[PDB]
Amino acid sequence: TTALVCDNGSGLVKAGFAGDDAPRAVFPSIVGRPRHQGVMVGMGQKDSYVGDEAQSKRGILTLKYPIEHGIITNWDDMEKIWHHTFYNELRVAPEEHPTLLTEAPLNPKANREKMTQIMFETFNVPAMYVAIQAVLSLYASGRTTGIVLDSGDGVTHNVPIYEGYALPHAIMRLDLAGRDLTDYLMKILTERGYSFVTTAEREIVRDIKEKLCYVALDFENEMATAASSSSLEKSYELPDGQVITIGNERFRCPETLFQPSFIGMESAGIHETTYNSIMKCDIDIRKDLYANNVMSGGTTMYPGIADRMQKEITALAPSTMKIKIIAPPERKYSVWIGGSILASLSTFQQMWITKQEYDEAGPSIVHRKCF
Amino acid sequence: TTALVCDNGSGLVKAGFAGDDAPRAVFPSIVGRPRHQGVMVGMGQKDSYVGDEAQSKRGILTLKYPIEHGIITNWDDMEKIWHHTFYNELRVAPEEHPTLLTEAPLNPKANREKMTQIMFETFNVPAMYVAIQAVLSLYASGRTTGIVLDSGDGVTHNVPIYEGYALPHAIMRLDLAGRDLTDYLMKILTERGYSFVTTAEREIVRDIKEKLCYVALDFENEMATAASSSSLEKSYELPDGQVITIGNERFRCPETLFQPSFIGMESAGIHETTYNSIMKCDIDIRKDLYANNVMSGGTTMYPGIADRMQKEITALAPSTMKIKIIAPPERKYSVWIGGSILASLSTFQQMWITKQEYDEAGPSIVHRKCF
Amino acid sequence: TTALVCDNGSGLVKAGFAGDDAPRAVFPSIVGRPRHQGVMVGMGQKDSYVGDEAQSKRGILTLKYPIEHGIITNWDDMEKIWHHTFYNELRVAPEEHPTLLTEAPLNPKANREKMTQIMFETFNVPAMYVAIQAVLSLYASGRTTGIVLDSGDGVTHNVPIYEGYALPHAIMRLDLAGRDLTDYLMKILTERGYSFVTTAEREIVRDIKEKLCYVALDFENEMATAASSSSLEKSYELPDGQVITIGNERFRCPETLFQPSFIGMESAGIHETTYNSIMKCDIDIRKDLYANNVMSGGTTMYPGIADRMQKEITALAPSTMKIKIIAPPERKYSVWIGGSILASLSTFQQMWITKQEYDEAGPSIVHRKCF
Ligand SMILES: Nc1ncnc2c1ncn2[C@@H]1O[C@H](COP(=O)(O)OP(=O)(O)O)[C@@H](O)[C@H]1O
Ligand SMILES: Nc1ncnc2c1ncn2[C@@H]1O[C@H](COP(=O)(O)OP(=O)(O)O)[C@@H](O)[C@H]1O
Numbered sequence A, B, C: 001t002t003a004l005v006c007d008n009g010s011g012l013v014k015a016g017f018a019g020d021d022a023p024r025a026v027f028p029s030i031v032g033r034p035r036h037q038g039v040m041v042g043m044g045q046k047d048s049y050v051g052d053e054a055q056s057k058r059g060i061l062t063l064k065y066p067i068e069h070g071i072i073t074n075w076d077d078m079e080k081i082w083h084h085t086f087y088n089e090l091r092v093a094p095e096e097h098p099t100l101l102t103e104a105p106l107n108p109k110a111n112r113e114k115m116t117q118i119m120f121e122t123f124n125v126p127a128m129y130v131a132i133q134a135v136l137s138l139y140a141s142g143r144t145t146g147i148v149l150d151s152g153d154g155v156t157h158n159v160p161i162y163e164g165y166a167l168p169h170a171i172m173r174l175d176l177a178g179r180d181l182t183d184y185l186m187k188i189l190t191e192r193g194y195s196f197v198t199t200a201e202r203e204i205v206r207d208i209k210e211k212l213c214y215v216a217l218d219f220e221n222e223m224a225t226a227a228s229s230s231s232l233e234k235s236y237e238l239p240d241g242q243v244i245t246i247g248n249e250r251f252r253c254p255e256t257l258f259q260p261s262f263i264g265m266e267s268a269g270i271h272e273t274t275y276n277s278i279m280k281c282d283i284d285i286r287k288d289l290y291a292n293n294v295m296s297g298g299t300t301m302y303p304g305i306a307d308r309m310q311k312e313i314t315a316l317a318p319s320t321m322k323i324k325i326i327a328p329p330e331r332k333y334s335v336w337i338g339g340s341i342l343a344s345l346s347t348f349q350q351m352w353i354t355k356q357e358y359d360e361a362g363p364s365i366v367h368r369k370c371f
C-alpha cells in the first residue's frame, strides 16, 4: 500500500503521502492553551488547540512549541500534534500505513527511542523508519554527493556526503537557527520604540522577519548606506493597523547567521563552519563538495543569501576551485520531497521496522543496524 | 420547571420568566415614603410605597433609590423591592423557581454576598446565580466576541470578550451614567429660569431628558447653530401646564458622556475609555473588537449617539481598521433577554448555586469558582 | 570642578553633586496643571506646577508623569522638570558643570538622543554622559560581578555582569513595576467599597502601597490565614479621615511581582526571569551570580521580599549552590550613589562627551564608542 511520510521538525510540521510532488499538509508545530477565564459557557471551548487553530486563536492563548531544538521536551503535546495531524490533516488511520520520521543529527537517543515507542504503541503503525533530514534533502536534489546545509527553525547542520557515503566525523551542528533570529529581531525592534513580549506576537515578529528581511552582500557598505540614505525603510501594518517602519534591521537581523557573536554565542558563522566541515574531509573529495554545495531548510530562503554565502566561502577557500551553491527555488520543502522519494522506492522495502520485530526487540531497534 | 430572570439594576428593575422575548415586569427601582402627616384617617394609607405606585404618588412622597451606583446602600428597601416584585408583578412564589441575578463588574463583594444570603434565606429560593450584565447583553446580541459598553442609570463599563473568554484586566468602569446626566440637566435648566430641586421633580427632568435630548454629531458646529438659529427649541409641558422651552440643552446635556470635565470629573469620555480598553487587550484581537462594538443599557438610546461614537472612535483608532457599532433597536433590554437566554440553556443547569450547597458552605459560595 | 549627577527615572528624580553620600534633591517626577477656572485674580497662580509643589497642590491639578516606562513621551514637561531641578532644588548653573544621565537598558535610541541634544543645546552643559542604571547600582555595592535586579516605578531589568564585563545578550527586561502595582492596588481596593479614580488619588494609593503592603513568604498559607484569622488588617487614615481597613490586599498586591498573570501579563515573575537570565550566561560563571544577586530600586523595599525571592530562586536553581541575595538597607538610592562614585573617579575624565565633540558629530555621539 501507500507509505506515509511525516516531517515533524520545528516551526512547521509537513506530512503527506509518499510518491507525491508536494506535502499535502503543513501547519505550525505549536500547541495552544487558553489563558483567560471564559464566561460564555457552552461554546465548546476545547482545552487545547493544535496547529493552525492555535495560530488563529492566539489572542487568547499561550503558544508552546513542543520541539525546541530538534529535541522534544513535551511528549504529551507532541502526541497531540501527531494525533491532530493524522485525524484532521491526512484523515487516515495509521493502522496499515508505515510512516517515515526525521530528526537532526547528533540528537539525544531518547528522542528517537520514545518517538518509535509512541509510534508503535499508541498509534500502532505496521512499520516505520527514522532518517536524517540532510540525506533526505540531498535525495530530493537527485545527487549522491555534496555538502548539505539544512537550516530550519531549531537547528543547523552540515552532512558532507560522497557517493552515497556520509562522513559522520565531520558533521558540524550549530544551534543557531530561525528561532534565535526571531528572538534577535524582537530584541532590536525595541530600539525603534516598538515592543513585543507575548508569545502570540513572536509569530508577528516571525512574519515580519519572513516578509521584510534580506541579506547584505557587503554588511559594512550596506550599514553605511542605511546610515546615510533612507531608501531601505519598508513599512508593515500590524494586525490592528498602526503601520510600523523598519530600516537597518531588514539586514541587521540575518547577519547573526554570519556572525553569531551578535547574540552572545562564541561559535562561528554559517560559512566558517561550512568551510571547516569541508576541511575536515579527505583532501581528494573537497572539490566535489565545493561544486555541489546544497542548501535547504526555511532559513535559507533569504533574498540574496546565495551570493553572500558564495562570496564568504570563496574568501575562505582557495581561489583555484569552482564554488557552486545549489539553492533551488522550492528548497523549503526539500526534506519532505526527499522523504517521499525515499519511501516510494523499491529497494527500501527491507529498511522499515515491523511491529513484530519491535515487540521482539523493544525500542532500541533504531540504534540497531535496522536504522 | 421555569427559571426566573431578575435584572435589578438602577433606575428600572426588569423581571420575568426565562425563555420569553420581553420582561414581564418593568417598574422604577424606587421606594417612596410619605412626607406629610395625613388627616383623613380610614384610608388605610400604607407606610411605604414602592415602584410604579410610588411613581404615581410622587407629589406627597420622598423618593429614594436603593441602588446608587451598582451597589446597594439600603437593604431594607431592596428587600421590599424584591418582595413587591415577586408577589405583585409576577405573582409567583420563589419557593419553586431558581432565579438569575446580575450586577456591574468591579462591585464590592459584600453586595453580591448579601444578595445571595437574602435570596437564599429570606425568600427561600431553590437555586440562584449571579451573572455579569455585559456578558448577558452580549448573549442577547448573538455573538461570542466584541467589546460591549453597557451604560445604565448609575454605572457604565466595558468588557472586552473573545470567543467566550473575557479579559478581566482590560475592564474599564466609569461612574458617569444617566443619573449624573439628569443631575447635570437639572443644573443647566436653571439658566433658562426653571428650577427643579425635589426628588419628585428629578423624575420630571428624567422624562425631559428622555424625550427631548439628543447627541450632537459635531458639538462645535451644533453649538454655533444653537447660537445662530433657533430651529432647535422643542417645547415641553410640565404636569401642570406652563410649557417650557429648551434649546442648547438638548445636546449640551449628553455631551457630558463625551467630556466629563463639564461636571468636574477627571476621567475620559465614553469613546476614549473604549479605545483604551481596546488598547489594553492583545494586539491580535483588536480588529475583531473594532468590528464588533456592542452597545446596551438605556443611556445608549440617545438619537445619534451611534454616529457620534463611530466618528470619535475612528478619530482615535487607526485609519485602516473598519469600525462597526452594533446598536439594535431594542438594545435597552439586551441584559434581560441575554439573561433569559442563559437561563433557558441546557448546559447552564449545573451552574446554579443550590440551597443545599449554600447551607453547606455559606454565602461565600459566589466568590468560589461556582460563580 | 565638581561634576553633577542627575538620575531622572520614573516616580522620583534624584539629583546632587558627585562625592556626596546622599542625593541633595528628591521630588516626584510629576508635572501638574490646573483643571478649574480660578476666580481670585491677582493671586499669581502660575500656569504649571512642578514636583513637590504639584504634589502639595494635587487637589486642584491633574498630574501627568512625563516618563512612562523608562521612555519619555512629553519632552516639554521633561524640559520643565530639568529646569526646575537645576534652578530650584540645586540652584546651580549648568554652564560649567558636566552632568551624568541614566536610563534603563533596551530603551529606544530616540529618548537618549534627544536627552543629549537638549542637555547640550538648551541647558548648555560643558560635558555629559549616559550610563546604565544597573551598572551604577552595582558600582555602589563595591563589587564587580553579580547580577542586579533594578526595579523602579516604570521598568524592571536584569544585567548579569562579570569582572566589569556585562553580558548584553542575557539582559531581561520586564515592563511590570511599582506603577502597575499601584494600578492593581487601585483595582482590588474596590472590592472593599473604596474607589480611587482620580490621578491625584493614585498618589494616595501609592502611599498606602508603601506603608501597609508586604510580601508573603508563603502565599497560599498567607491567603489561608487572611481567610481564617483577621490579625492582618491594618487601618489607614485618608487625608480627610474616614479610616479604611485592608486585609488580604497587603500581600495580594506585590504578589503580582511573582505572578504577572494576575493583571493579564503573560511574562513570568521576578524569580523566573532572574533564573532564566542566569541560565542564559556561561556555565562557568553562574555560581558567582547565584552568590551575588544584587537588588536595587524602590520596588525592592518590600518587607520580606528577600526571603521570598531566595525561597523561590532556590526552588528553581540547583540544590548544591549557595544562593545569596545582597539587599542593603539603603538600596533605594543605590543608583544615585553609584553615579556619584562613577563621577568622583579619576579614570572617568576621558569618558564624557564635551560640547565640542557634540557640535562636531551631532546627537548621534552617544551611540558612538564614546558611550
Ligand atoms: N521566506 C522566508 N524568509 C526568512 N525566513 C523564513 C522564510 N520562510 C520560512 N522562514 C523561517 O523558517 C522557519 C521554518 O523552518 P522549517 O524549514 O519549517 O524547519 P523544518 O524544515 O525543520 O520543519 C520559520 O521559523 C521561519 O522563520
Ligand atoms: N430614550 C431614552 N433617551 C434618553 N435616556 C434614556 C432613554 N431610555 C432610557 N434612558 C435612561 O436610561 C436609564 C435607565 O437605565 P437602565 O438601562 O434601566 O439601567 P439598568 O439596565 O442597569 O437598570 C434611565 O435613567 C433613563 O434616564
Ligand SMILES: Nc1ncnc2c1ncn2[C@@H]1O[C@H](COP(=O)(O)OP(=O)(O)O)[C@@H](O)[C@H]1O
Residues within 6 Å of the ligand: C008, C009, C010, C011, C012, C013, C151, C152, C153, C154, C178, C179, C206, C209, C210, C211, C213, C297, C298, C299, C301, C302, C332, C335
Ligand atoms: N517602602 C516601600 N514600599 C513599597 N514601595 C515602595 C517603597 N519605597 C518606594 N516604593 C515604590 O518605588 C517607586 C519609586 O521607584 P524609584 O526607585 O524611585 O525608581 P527610579 O529609581 O527609577 O526613580 C515608587 O513608585 C513607590 O511605589
